Amino acid sequence: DVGLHAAFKSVFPIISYSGNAALEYVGYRLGEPAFDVKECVLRGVTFA
C-alpha cells in the first residue's frame, strides 16, 4: 500500500536512454532516530 515503499516501486525500474543499464529497487531500510525528541527540542535537530 501507499508509503515510501509505494513511491519506490513507483519509480523502481529504470532503463538507460538508448542504453542497456537498469536500477532495480530492493526493500529500503529505515534508520534509527539519531536524537530523542526532547533532545531534538533542546537542540533543534527536527527529530529526524
The method of structure determination was cryo-EM
Is 22 strand, coil or helix?
Answer: strand
Residue with the three cell numbers 515503499:
5
**13/26 Cα distance (integer angstroms):** 11
Helix (H, G, I), strand (E, B) or coil at 33: coil
Q: Identity (one letter) of the amino acid at 37?
A: V
As beta bridge partners, residue 15 has 22
- Helix or strand or coil: residue 11? coil
Identity of the amino acid at 42: L
Nearest by Cα to 26 from 38, 12, 6, 36: 12
Task: Report the largest interatomic distance among the alpha carbons of the chain, rounded to a whole angstrom.
Answer: 52
